[PDB]
Design a protein around this ligand. Structure first.
Ligand code: PC1
Ligand code: PC1
Ligand code: 3PE
Ligand code: 3PE
Ligand code: 3PE
Ligand code: 3PE
Ligand code: 3PE
Ligand code: 3PE
Ligand code: PLC
Ligand code: CHD
Ligand code: MYR
Ligand code: ZN
Lengths: 128, 64, 122, 124, 110, 459, 88, 12, 171, 174, 71
C-alpha cells in the first residue's frame, strides 16, 4: 500500500511504475522489434557517410530540414480560421493592447489633472 | 631584484603619473577633490591660525 | 520582554504606549522639578561632527573619547578608560528612560483605581 | 499520430511524446550526445524547448500536486505570521530618548527665524 | 592521493586562518563610533545568541550520534521538503520556462 | 556635401576601369578614404546647424548617421568577397555598383534640406535594395521577399507624398529651416488626424512598427550578407530620421495620436523579444531582434522629450553597428556549414576560439551591458518614459530580462556544448573574417570615451 | 591532475585483489580468466555485487547494459582499461 | 610522460 | 526491450545504491545489504510467470516510495558534478589537417606517424564497405551490432572514430 | 588663481595642530615625509621644467563675446531674418542657463561632502540658493518639449503671466 | 597538484604525513585556544554582561513622583 504516483505534464510517469511495460505479449515484443529495425537502417546510413574518409563537409539530415520547415513555412498553408483560432488571435493579439491602453491612458490623465491644479510635487524636476 | 623591478614599474611609476595628474590638472579645477573638514575637539590649537578652542565645562566626574 | 504579554494578553490602557508617551505633564508628581543640562554646547558638537543620533545628553564623554583615539594613534588598545566612562554615562541615561516608562505605568494604573473610586459612588 | 486537424497550422507533422531530452537514456551511443538525438530521427515539434538547458519533465520523487501544496502552504503561512507580528511588535520598556536644544531643532536644518516651540526635558 | 603538503595551499589558508581569528578584534577597535550600542539588557537577551548556538550543537551532536544505530529510516515529508530545496526550484524552474516558452511559439510567433 | 557626393560617384568609374583582379582591392581602399574625410562633418555649433547650400545641410542628427553610412560600405565589400568569388566579372561589378549607388542616395538623404528632396532619395533606395535581395539572394523565397519589402514601403510612402505636397501649399515651403520658424499648431480635427497618419505611417513601416514588420523577417533573411548589413544598419534608421524631422510640424496633435503606436511598440517589443527565444533559424533570430530594439526608438520619438531624443539618436547608432555585426557573425558560420539552422553546428568555441570572442562582445552589447552606447541609448529612453508614465518601467524591465535571455541563448547554442561530430569543414578563421568583426566592435567601444558626438541636436 | 595514471598491471592486480576478499570465491579457483558462472559457480545476483564492489574500487559507474556482459576478471580489466585510455 | 595535445590551429 | 531477469537485476542494483545513501556508514549499510539480498534470494524459485512478475511491480513500487530524494551519484556519472566536465578540451582528430605547415613542423614524428593511419584508413575503407554489404540482410540490418574483421590484414568495419576518439583527460 | 573663488567659494580651512599622547611612532608622519621626497619632489622638478618651456612660447585665446540682438518679442510675425537671430540668442542663453544650474549644483554637492555630519545645518545656505535657481530654471525651460524654441518659451511665459495676473486680480477682488 | 614535497600514495592505508605539516596544524589550534582564554579574562563582560540591569519592581513612588491614591 503506497501512494499511487501522480503525473502532470511536467512530471512523466516512471517507466518502472508503467503497467504498459509488463503486459508484454508477442505484439508488444514485436512492435519494439520493428522500431529497432527502422532505427537500425538509419544508423547504417549515417555511419557509412560518417566514417567515409573521402567525404568532407556536412551530412545533411533530412529530418532536420523537415522539422524547421514545419515550424516556419508549412504553418500558414495549413491554417483555417475557425472559432479556436479567431478567439485566440483576438484574445492574445488584441487583448494586451487594449488592456495597456487604458492602464496608461488612465494614469496619464490622472497625473495631468494633478499638475494643472498644482497638487503634484515637481520642486526639483527640471529633467524630462 | 624581482620585487625591486616590480615595485618600480608597477607602483612607483604609476604614482608619479597619478600624483602628477592630480596635482596640476585635477586639483586646479574647482571641487574636483573635496575633503571632509577635520574634526575640531575642545582644547586644540589650529595650525592655520593658532586659535585655541575652549575646553568643555567641568564634568561631575565619577569613576564607575 | 515580558510586559508585552501584559499589553497584548491583557489590558492596554493600563500599559504605556511608546508611540504616545509621556501621557502626563512633567510637573505632575514632582514639585519644583529640575532639568538636565548639556555639558557640551552645540558649536562643540557641530565642530566635533557627531552623528545626530549621538547628540544626546551623554555627549561630552563621546567627544573626549574621540579626542583620545585621534591622539593615541596608532595605539588602539589604549583609551579604554574613556570608553567605559561614555558607556556608563549612556547606561545611566538609558535607565532614566526606564524610570519614565515605569512612572508611566504606575500613573496610568493609579488613574484606573481613581476612575473606579470616583465613578462607583456616582 | 499527427496533431489534431484543428487548423492551428500543424499539418501532418508527427506528435511525439512530450518528454524532455533530459529523460532519454544517457548511456546510449547517440549521434548527438548533447541533444541525445539520432541522425534521421523525427524531431519533436517543441524540441528546442526540451533541450537539456531548458524545461525538464523527468519524474519527481514527490508528486507534482503535493509539491505545490507544500510550497504554497509554507510561503502563505510565513506571510501571514509576518503580518501577525507586525501588529504585535517586540520592544523594551524604555521611554522616548531625549535630546537637547529643542530636540535638536537647529541640527536637523530647522528654520532659525521661526523660533521653535520650547521642548524641555526634566531630571529623573 | 591525500596530500596537503604544498606551500601554495598552506600559505593561502594560513593567512585566512590568521585573519579569521584576530581580524574582528582589530577592526572593531579602530572604526570610529557611529551609533549608541545597547549595552544593558536582561540576562536572557545578553546571551540568547550563545545559548541557541550551544543548543544547536547539543541537538546536532546527539542527532548525529543516532545515525550510527542499525535502525531503519522513515521517509519524512519535512525531510524531503528540506532536501529538495522546498520544491521552489523543482516547480519554478519547470513551470515558468514552460509557460513562457510555449507562449513564445504557439501564441507570439505561430 | 559635394565633397562627399562627388567622390562617392567616382567609385563607379573606379570599379569598371580597374583591372580584373583588383576590383575588390581598389573599391575597398578608396571607400575607406571617403569615410575618413567624413569626420570633417563634426564641425557643429551649439546654436546653429551646418548649412552648405540651398539643397543640403548637416546637423548633429544627420552627422552620426552619415559617418555610419559611409563607414559601412567598405565593410560590406569585405563581407561579399566569399559568395561572389565565383561570379561573372560583369556581375561582380554590377553588385558593387548597386552598393555604391545605395550609399550615394543615402548620403544625400540625411543631408537633404527639403522634405520632398528627402522623399525622392528616401524612396530611391528601394531600387538598388530590391535588386540586391532578388538578384543575389540564395533561397527560392528571395523572389517573394522582394515583393513583401517593396509594396510594404510604397503603401506607406505614397500617402506621404500627398501629405508633403499639401503642406507646401498650406505653409509655402518644405525647407526644414523655414518650417522651424513657420511651424503652426495642428488643431484637432478629423482632417488633421489623417494628415498625421500620412506623415508618420510611412516611417512607422520602415522602423518597423509591430504589426507592420512582416516584411523584415523575409527581407533581412533572404538578402545577401551585404544587403542584410545595410538593411539592418541604415535603412531601418531612415524611418527614425524621418520621424525626428517631421514631428516638428505635427504638434500638439502628437499628444493623443501617439497612444496607439506607443502600445504597439511597448507591447510589441515583449512579443518580438519572445519570438527570438524560439527561433529555429539563426539569421532570423537576429532579424527579429532589430524589431524589438526599434520599438524603443519609435516610443522615444513619440514622447518628445530632450532625454528621449538624445536616447533615440544614440540607440540608432548603437543598433546599426551591433545589428550589422551579428549578421556578419552568423554569416561566417554559414559560409562554412552552408545552412542557417541555429542548432545544426554547435560547440564552435572549441573549433574557432577567437571567433567565439567576437560573439561574446557582440552579445554583451546586444543586451546593453554598460557603459556601452547600447546601454546609454536604452538608459536615456527608459528615464524619459518613466517621466511619461511610471508604469512603463514594468515593460522596460521585462523586456530587459528577455533581451538577455535570447542573446545568451544564441551565444550558448552555437559557441558551447559539444561540437557536431558529422561536420569536418570548420576551417580556421580567415583574416578577412576576423578583420571584419574588429571594424564593428572597435569603433563601437571607442564611442563610449566621447559619447557626446552621437547624442543628437538636443545634447 | 596529481592523480597517478593507471597501468594494465595495476588494474588487473586491483581486480583480483577485490575478488580475493570475496568470501564466496576460493582464491585457488580464482584466476585471471576464471569465469564467474561456469568456473566459480555464482548466480547473477552475486555477479552484480561484484561490479558494485568494483565500481567503488575505481570510483566510476558502469552501465547495467555493459556490466551484465562482464563475467570474468579478464573482461572487466579490458572494460576498465579501455574506459580510461589505459595502454601502458 | 608527455602526450600530444590536439588543438585547433592557433597560427591564424 | 528488457528481459524480466534484467529488470529484476536492474532493480537490485538501484535499491542498494539508494539504500547505501540512507545508511551512509559501511557497517550499518553492510548489515542491511544482506537483509535486502535475503528478500531477493527467497523468491528466486518462484516459477510462475504471472505471480513472479506481480512481485516485481510491488518491488518497483516500494522502491519508488523509499528512494533517497538525493541519491549519491558518482562524480562522472550523468548527474554527478563532473559529468561532461572535460568535453570542452576534446577536439576531433581532423582539426589537425588544418594546421599551418610551420605549425606541423614542430611535431615531425607525430604527423609522419599520422599519415600511416590515414593511409591505413583509405586502404581499408573499401574492404570495410564490402564486408558489411554482404552480411547485411536484404532489408538492411535488424540490429545495431556490427561484425568483426574475418581475414588477416582486415580491420573491423567502421573502426576509425571508435579508435580515434579523444582521450578522457585530453588536456 | 586657477579659478575665481567668488564663483566657487571655499570656506576658510581650520586644521587642528597634532597633539600626540603616546610613546609609539606615528607611521603616517614618517610615510608622509618619504612621499614628499621620493614621489612628490621629482614631480615638481619635472613640472617646473615644462613650465619654463611654456614661458618661452606664450600665446593667448579669448573667451568669445556675443553682442545682444533683438529678442523674439521684438520680431515681426514670420520674419525669418529677425526670428533667426532671436532664436539663436535664446539657444545660446539656454546653454548658459543649463551651466548655471550646474554651478549651483556643484556648490551644493561640494558643501554636503565638506560638512560631514553637520551638512544638514551648515549647507542650508547653499540649499536655499539651489532651490531659487532650480525654480527659476523650471519656469522658463520646462515642458517645452524636444522641439523647444523661442516662440514656445514666450508662449509659456504669457500663459504664466495671465494666470499670475488673474490670481492677483481675484485675490484683491475679495 | 604539482610542486611541494612529494608523497607516494598508499593503497588501503593511512596516508603519510610530515613533521612540518602536523606541527603547523597543532600550533594554530593552540593559538586559537590561548586567544579565547586571554580575551575571556580581560573582557568577561563582553560575553557575560556589561552593567547590572535594574529591577523596576524595587523603585519607590517618591523618586518616581507617583502621588498618593488619596490625591
Ligand atoms: C517582471 C519580471 C520579469 C518577467 C520575466 C521573467 C519571469 C520568468 C519568465 C522567463 C523564465 C524562462 C526563461 C527562458 C527560458 C530559459 C531558462 C530555461 O529554459 O529553464 C532552464 C533552467 C533550469 O535550471 P535548473 O537549475 O532549475 O535545472 C536544470 C536541469 N537539471 C538540474 C536537471 C540539470 O531554468 C532557469 O534557470 C530559470 C527558471 C527560473 C526563472 C523563472 C522564475 C523567476 C523567479 C520567480 C520568483
Ligand atoms: C477603428 C475606428 C475606425 C473609425 C474611426 C472611429 C470613429 C470614432 O469613434 O470617432 C469618435 C471618437 C470619439 O472621440 P472624440 O469625440 O474626441 O472625436 C475625436 C476628435 N475629433 C472629432 C475632433 C477628431 O473618437 C475616438 O476616440 C475613436 C478612436 C478610434 C481609434 C480606434 C482604433 C485605433 C486602434
Ligand atoms: C516575498 C515573497 C515572495 C514569494 C515568491 C514565491 C511565491 C510562491 C507561491 C507558491 C507557488 C505554488 C505554485 C502554484 C501553481 C501550480 C500550478 C499547477 O500546478 O498547474 C500546472 C499544470 C499542471 O497540471 P496539468 O499537467 O495540466 O494536469 C494534467 C494534464 N495532463 O500545468 C500547466 O502548466 C497548465 C497551465 C496552468 C499553469 C499554472 C497557472 C499559471
Ligand atoms: C474581433 C474578434 C472577433 C472574434 C469572433 C469572430 C470569430 C468567430 O466567431 O468565428 C466565426 C468563423 C468561424 O466559423 P467556422 O464555421 O468554424 O469556420 C468556417 C468553416 N467553413 O470565423 C471565420 O470563419 C473567419 C474568421 C473571422 C474572424 C477573423 C478576424 C478576427 C481577428 C483575428 C485576430 C486579429 C489579430 C490582430 C493582431 C493585432 C496586432 C498584434
Ligand atoms: C472597433 C474600433 C472602433 C472603436 O470601437 O473605438 C471606439 C472608441 C470610442 O468609442 P466609445 O468608447 O464607445 O466612446 C467613449 C470614448 N471615450 O475608441 C476610443 O477612443 C477608445 C479606445 C478604443 C478601444 C477599443 C479598440 C478596439 C481594438 C482596436 C481595433 C481592432 C480592429
Ligand atoms: C487597411 C485600411 C486602409 C484603408 C484606409 C484608407 C484611409 C484613407 C481615407 C481617405 C484619405 C483621408 C482623407 O479623406 O483626407 C482628406 C482631407 C481633405 O480635407 P481638406 O479638403 O484638406 O479640408 C481642409 C482644407 N483647407 O485631407 C486633408 O485635409 C489634408 C491632410 C493631408 C492629406 C493626407 C493624405 C490622405 C491620408 C492618407 C491615407 C490615410 C493615412 C495613411 C494610411 C497609411 C496606410
Ligand atoms: C497590426 C496593425 C498595425 C497597424 C496599426 C495602425 C495604427 C493604428 C491606427 C491609428 C489610430 C490612430 C487613432 C485614431 C484617431 C484618433 C481619434 C481621436 O480624435 O480621438 C481623440 C482622443 C482624445 O481624447 P482625450 O485624450 O481624452 O482628449 C484630449 C484630446 N485633445 O484620443 C484618444 O482617445 C487616443 C486614441 C484612441 C485610440 C486608442 C486605441 C488603442 C488600442 C490599441 C492599439 C490597437 C492598434 C490596432 C490593432 C489592429 C488589430
Ligand atoms: C513574458 C511575459 C509577459 C509579461 C508581461 C509584463 C507583466 C505584466 C504584469 C501584469 C500587469 C501588472 C501591472 C498592473 C498595472 C500597474 C498598476 C500599479 O500597481 O501601479 C503601481 C505603480 C504606480 O505608481 P503610482 O504613481 O503610485 O500610481 C498609482 C496607481 N494606482 O507603478 C510603479 O510604481 C512601477 C512598479 C514597478 C514594479 C517593478 C516591476 C515588476 C517586476 C518586479 C519583479 C518581481 C518582484 C515584484 C515584487 C517587488 C515589487 C517591486
Ligand atoms: C529557539 C530555537 C531552538 C532550536 C530548535 C528548534 C527545533 C529545530 C528542529 C530541527 C531538527 C533537525 O535538525 O532535524 C534534522 C533532520 C535529519 O538530520 P540528519 O539526522 O543529519 O539526517 C537524517 C538522515 N537519515 C534519515 C538517513 C538518518 O532533518 C530534518 O528534520 C529536516 C528539516 C526539518 C525542517 C522543519 C522545519 C521547517 C518546517 C517547514 C516544512 C519542512
Ligand atoms: C615580482 C614577481 C614575483 C617575485 C618573486 O619571486 O617573489 C615576478 C614573477 C614574474 C614577473 C613578471 C613577468 O616576468 C612579466 C614581466 C617581465 C619583465 O621583466 C617586466 C616586468 C614583468 C611584469 C615581471 C614583473 C615581476 O618581476 C614578476 C611579477
Ligand atoms: C523582549 O523585550 C524581547 C523578546 C524576548 C526574546 C527572548 C525570548 C526568550 C525569553 C523567554 C525565556 C526566558 C526563560 C529562560
Ligand atoms: Zn559559401
Amino acid at each position: 500500500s503506497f501512494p499511487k504516483y501522480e503525473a502532470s505534464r511536467l512530471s512523466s510517469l516512471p517507466t518502472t511504475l508503467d503497467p504498459a511495460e509488463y503486459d508484454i505479449s508477442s505484439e508488444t515484443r514485436k512492435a519494439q522489434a520493428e522500431r529497432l529495425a527502422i532505427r537500425s537502417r538509419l544508423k547504417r546510413e549515417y555511419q557509412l557517410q560518417y566514417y567515409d574518409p573521402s567525404r568532407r563537409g556536412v551530412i545533411e539530415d533530412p529530418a532536420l530540414v523537415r522539422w524547421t520547415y514545419a515550424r516556419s513555412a508549412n504553418i500558414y498553408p495549413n491554417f483555417r480560421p475557425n472559432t479556436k483560432t479567431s478567439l485566440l488571435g483576438a484574445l492574445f493579439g488584441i487583448g494586451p493592447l487594449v488592456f495597456w491602453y487604458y492602464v496608461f491612458k488612465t494614469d496619464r490623465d490622472r497625473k495631468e489633472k494633478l499638475i494643472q491644479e498644482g497638487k503634484l510635487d515637481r520642486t526639483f524636476n527640471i529633467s524630462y | 631584484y624581482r620585487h625591486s623591478i616590480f615595485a618600480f614599474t608597477h607602483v612607483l611609476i604609476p604614482v608619479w603619473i597619478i600624483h602628477y595628474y592630480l596635482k596640476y590638472h585635477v586639483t586646479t579645477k574647482p571641487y574636483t577633490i573635496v575633503e571632509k573638514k577635520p574634526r575640531i575637539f575642545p582644547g586644540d590649537t589650529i595650525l592655520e591660525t593658532g586659535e585655541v578652542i575652549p575646553p568643555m565645562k567641568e564634568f561631575p566626574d565619577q569613576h564607575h | 520582554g515580558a510586559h508585552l504579554a501584559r499589553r497584548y494578553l491583557g489590558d492596554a490602557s493600563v500599559e504605556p504606549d511608546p508611540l504616545r508617551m509621556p501621557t502626563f505633564p512633567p510637573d505632575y508628581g514632582f514639585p519644583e522639578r529640575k532639568e538636565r543640562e548639556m555639558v557640551a554646547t552645540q558649536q562643540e558638537m557641530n565642530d566635533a561632527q557627531l552623528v545626530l543620533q549621538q547628540r544626546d545628553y551623554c555627549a561630552h564623554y563621546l567627544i573626549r573619547f574621540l579626542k583620545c583615539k585621534r591622539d593615541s594613534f596608532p595605539n588602539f588598545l589604549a583609551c579604554k578608560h574613556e570608553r567605559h566612562d561614555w558607556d556608563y554615562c549612556e547606561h545611566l541615561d538609558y535607565v532614566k528612560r526606564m524610570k519614565e516608562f515605569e512612572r508611566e505605568r504606575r500613573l496610568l494604573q493609579r488613574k484606573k483605581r481613581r476612575e473606579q473610586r470616583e465613578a462607583d459612588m456616582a | 499520430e499527427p496533431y489534431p486537424d484543428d487548423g492551428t497550422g500543424y499539418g501532418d507533422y508527427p506528435k511525439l511524446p512530450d518528454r524532455s531530452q533530459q529523460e532519454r537514456d544517457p548511456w546510449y551511443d547517440w549521434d548527438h550526445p548533447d541533444l541525445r538525438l539520432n541522425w534521421g530521427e523525427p524531431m519533436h515539434w517543441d524540441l528546442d524547448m526540451y533541450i537539456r538547458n531548458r524545461v525538464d519533465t523527468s519524474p519527481t520523487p514527490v508528486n507534482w500536486n503535493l509539491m505545490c501544496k507544500h510550497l504554497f502552504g509554507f510561503v502563505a503561512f510565513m506571510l501571514f505570521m509576518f503580518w501577525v507580528g507586525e501588529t504585535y511588535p517586540a520592544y523594551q520598556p524604555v521611554g522616548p530618548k531625549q535630546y537637547p536644544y529643542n530636540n535638536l531643532y537647529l541640527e536637523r536644518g530647522g528654520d532659525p527665524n521661526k523660533e521653535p516651540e520650547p521642548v524641555v526635558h526634566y531630571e529623573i | 592521493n591525500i596530500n596537503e603538503n604544498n606551500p601554495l595551499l598552506i600559505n593561502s589558508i594560513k593567512r585566512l586562518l590568521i585573519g579569521s581569528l584576530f581580524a574582528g578584534y582589530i577592526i572593531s577597535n579602530n572604526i570610529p563610533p557611529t551609533t549608541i550600542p545597547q549595552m544593558t539588557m536582561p540576562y536572557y537577551l545578553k546571551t540568547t545568541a550563545l545559548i541557541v548556538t550551544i543548543l544547536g550543537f547539543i541537538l546536532a551532536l546527539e542527532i548525529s550520534n543516532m545515525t550510527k544505530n542499525l535502525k531503519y529510516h522513515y521517509p519524512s515529508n519535512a525531510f524531503k521538503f528540506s532536501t529538495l530545496l522546498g520544491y521552489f526550484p523543482t516547480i519554478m524552474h519547470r513551470l515558468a520556462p514552460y509557460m513562457n516558452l510555449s507562449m513564445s511559439q504557439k501564441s507570439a510567433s505561430s | 556635401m559635394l565633397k562627399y557626393i562627388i567622390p562617392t560617384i567616382m567609385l563607379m568609374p573606379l570599379t569598371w576601369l580597374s583591372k580584373n583582379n583588383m576590383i575588390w582591392v581598389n573599391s575597398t581602399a578608396h571607400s575607406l578614404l571617403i569615410s575618413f574625410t567624413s569626420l570633417l562633418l563634426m564641425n557643429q555649433f551649439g546654436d546653429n546647424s551646418l548649412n552648405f547650400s540651398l539643397l543640403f545641410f548637416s546637423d548633429s542628427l544627420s552627422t552620426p548617421l552619415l559617418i555610419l553610412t559611409m563607414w559601412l560600405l567598405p565593410l560590406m565589400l569585405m563581407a561579399s568577397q566569399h559568395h561572389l568569388s565565383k561570379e561573372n566579372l560583369t556581375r561582380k561589378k554590377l553588385f558593387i555598383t548597386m552598393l555604391i549607388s545605395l550609399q550615394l542616395f543615402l548620403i544625400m538623404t540625411f543631408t537633404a534640406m527639403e522634405l520632398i528632396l528627402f522623399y525622392i532619395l528616401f524612396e530611391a533606395t528601394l531600387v538598388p535594395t530590391l535588386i540586391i535581395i532578388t538578384r543575389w539572394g540564395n533561397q527560392t523565397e528571395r523572389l517573394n521577399a522582394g515583393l513583401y519589402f517593396l509594396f510594404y514601403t510604397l503603401a506607406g510612402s505614397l500617402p506621404l507624398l500627398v501629405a508633403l505636397i499639401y503642406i507646401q501649399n498650406t505653409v509655402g515651403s518644405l525647407n526644414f529651416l523655414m518650417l522651424q520658424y513657420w511651424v503652426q499648431p495642428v488643431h484637432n480635427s478629423w482632417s488633421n488626424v489623417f494628415m498625421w497618419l500620412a506623415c508618420m505611417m510611412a516611417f512607422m513601416v520602415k522602423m518597423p512598427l509591430y504589426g507592420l514588420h512582416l516584411w523584415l523577417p523575409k527581407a533581412h533573411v533572404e538578402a545577401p550578407i551585404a544587403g542584410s548589413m545595410v538593411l539592418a544598419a541604415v535603412l531601418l534608421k531612415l524611418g527614425g530620421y524621418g520621424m525626428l524631422r517631421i514631428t516638428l510640424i505635427l504638434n500638439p496633435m502628437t499628444d493623443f495620436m501617439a497612444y496607439p503606436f506607443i502600445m504597439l511598440s511597448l507591447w510589441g517589443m515583449i512579443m518580438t523579444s519572445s519570438i527570438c527565444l524560439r527561433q529555429t533559424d539563426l539569421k532570423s533570430l537576429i532579424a527579429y531582434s532589430s524589431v524589438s530594439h526599434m520599438a524603443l526608438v519609435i516610443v522615444a520619438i513619440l514622447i518628445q522629450t530632450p532625454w528621449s531624443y538624445m536616447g533615440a539618436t544614440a540607440l540608432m547608432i548603437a543598433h546599426g553597428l551591433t545589428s550589422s555585426m551579428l549578421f556578419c557573425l552568423a554569416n561566417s558560420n554559414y559560409e562554412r556549414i552552408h545552412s542557417r539552422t541555429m542548432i545544426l553546428a554547435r560547440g564552435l568555441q572549441t573549433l574557432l576560439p577567437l571567433m567565439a570572442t567576437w560573439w561574446l562582445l557582440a552579445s554583451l552589447t546586444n543586451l546593453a551591458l554598460p557603459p556601452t552606447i547600447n546601454l546609454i541609448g536604452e538608459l536615456f529612453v527608459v528615464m524619459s518614459t518613466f517621466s511619461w508614465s511610471n508604469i512603463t518601467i514594468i515593460l522596460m524591465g521585462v523586456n530587459m530580462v528577455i533581451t538577455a535571455l535570447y542573446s545568451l541563448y544564441m551565444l550558448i547554442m552555437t559557441q558551447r556544448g559539444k561540437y557536431t561530430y558529422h561536420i569536418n569543414n570548420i576551417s580556421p578563421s580567415f583574416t578577412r573574417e576576423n578583420a571584419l568583426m574588429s571594424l564593428h566592435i572597435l569603433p563601437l567601444l571607442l564611442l563610449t570615451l566621447n559619447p557626446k558626438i552621437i547624442l543628437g541636436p538636443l545634447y | 591532475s596529481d592523480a597517478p595514471p593507471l597501468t594494465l598491471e595495476g588494474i588487473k592486480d586491483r581486480v583480483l585483489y577485490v575478488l580475493k576478499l570475496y568470501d564466496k570465491i576460493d582464491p585457488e579457483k580464482l584466476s585471471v580468466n576464471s569465469h564467474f558462472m561456469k568456473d566459480l559457480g555464482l548466480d547473477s545476483l552475486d555477479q552484480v555485487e561484484i561490479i558494485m564492489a568494483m565500481e567503488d574500487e575505481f570510483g566510476f559507474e558502469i552501465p547495467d547494459i555493459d556490466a551484465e556482459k562482464l563475467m570474468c576478471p579478464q573482461e572487466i580489466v579490458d572494460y576498465i582499461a579501455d574506459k580510461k585510455d589505459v595502454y601502458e | 610522460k608527455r602526450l600530444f595535445i590536439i588543438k585547433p590551429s592557433g597560427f591564424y | 526491450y528488457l528481459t524480466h531477469q534484467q529488470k529484476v537485476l536492474r532493480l537490485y542494483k538501484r535499491a542498494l545504491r539508494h539504500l547505501e545513501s540512507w545508511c551512509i556508514h559501511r557497517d550499518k549499510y553492510r548489515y542491511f545489504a544482506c537483509l535486502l539480498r535475503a528478500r531477493f534470494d527467497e523468491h528466486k524459485n518462484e516459477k510462475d510467470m504471472v505471480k513472479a512478475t506481480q512481485l516485481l511491480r510491488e518491488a518497483e513500487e516500494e522502491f519508488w516510495h523509499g528512494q533517497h530524494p538525493q541519491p549519491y551519484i558518482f562524480p562522472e556519472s550523468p548527474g554527478g558534478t563532473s559529468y561532461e566536465r572535460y568535453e570542452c578540451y576534446k577536439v576531433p582528430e581532423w582539426c589537425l589537417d588544418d594546421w599551418h605547415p610551420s605549425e606541423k613542423a614542430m611535431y615531425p614524428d607525430y604527423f609522419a606517424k599520422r599519415e600511416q593511419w590515414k593511409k591505413l584508413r583509405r586502404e581499408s575503407w573499401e574492404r570495410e564497405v564490402k564486408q558489411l554489404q554482404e552480411e547485411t540482410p536484404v532489408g538492411g540490418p535488424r540490429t545495431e551490432a556490427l561484425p568483426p574483421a574475418r581475414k588477416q590484414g582486415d580491420l573491423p568495419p567502421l573502426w576509425w572514430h571508435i579508435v580515434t576518439r579523444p582521450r578522457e583527460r585530453p588536456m | 588663481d586657477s579659478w575665481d573663488k567668488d564663483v566657487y567659494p571655499e570656506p576658510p580651512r581650520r586644521t587642528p595642530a597634532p597633539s600626540p599622547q603616546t610613546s609609539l611612532p606615528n607611521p603616517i608622519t614618517y610615510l608622509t615625509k618619504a612621499f614628499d621626497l621620493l614621489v612628490d619632489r621629482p614631480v615638481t622638478l619635472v613640472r617646473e621644467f615644462i613650465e619654463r618651456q611654456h614661458a618661452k612660447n606664450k600665446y593667448y585665446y579669448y573667451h568669445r563675446e556675443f553682442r545682444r540682438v533683438p529678442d523674439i518679442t521684438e520680431c515681426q510675425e514670420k520674419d525669418v531674418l529677425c526670428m533667426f537671430e532671436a532664436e539663436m540668442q535664446w539657444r545660446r542663453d539656454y546653454k548658459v542657463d543649463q551651466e548655471i544650474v550646474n554651478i549651483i549644483q556643484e556648490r551644493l554637492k561640494a558643501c554636503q561632502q565638506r560638512e560631514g555630519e553637520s551638512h544638514r545645518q551648515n549647507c542650508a545656505k547653499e540649499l536655499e540658493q539651489f532651490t531659487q535657481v532650480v525654480k527659476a530654471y523650471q519656469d522658463r525651460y520646462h515642458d517645452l518639449g524636444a522641439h523647444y524654441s523661442a516662440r514656445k518659451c514666450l508662449a509659456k511665459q504669457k500663459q504664466r503671466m495671465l494666470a499670475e495676473r488673474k490670481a492677483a486680480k481675484e485675490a484683491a477682488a475679495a | 597538484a604539482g610542486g611541494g614535497a612529494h608523497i607516494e600514495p598508499r593503497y588501503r592505508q593511512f596516508p603519510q604525513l610530515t613533521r612540518s605539516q602536523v606541527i603547523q596544524a597543532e600550533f594554530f589550534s593552540a593559538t586559537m585556544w590561548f586567544w579565547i582564554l586571554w580575551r575571556f579574562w580581560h573582557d568577561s563582560d563582553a560575553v557575560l554582561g556589561h552593567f547590572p540591569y535594574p529591577d523596576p519592581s524595587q523603585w519607590t513612588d517618591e523618586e518616581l513622583g507617583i502621588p498618593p491614591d488619596d490625591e
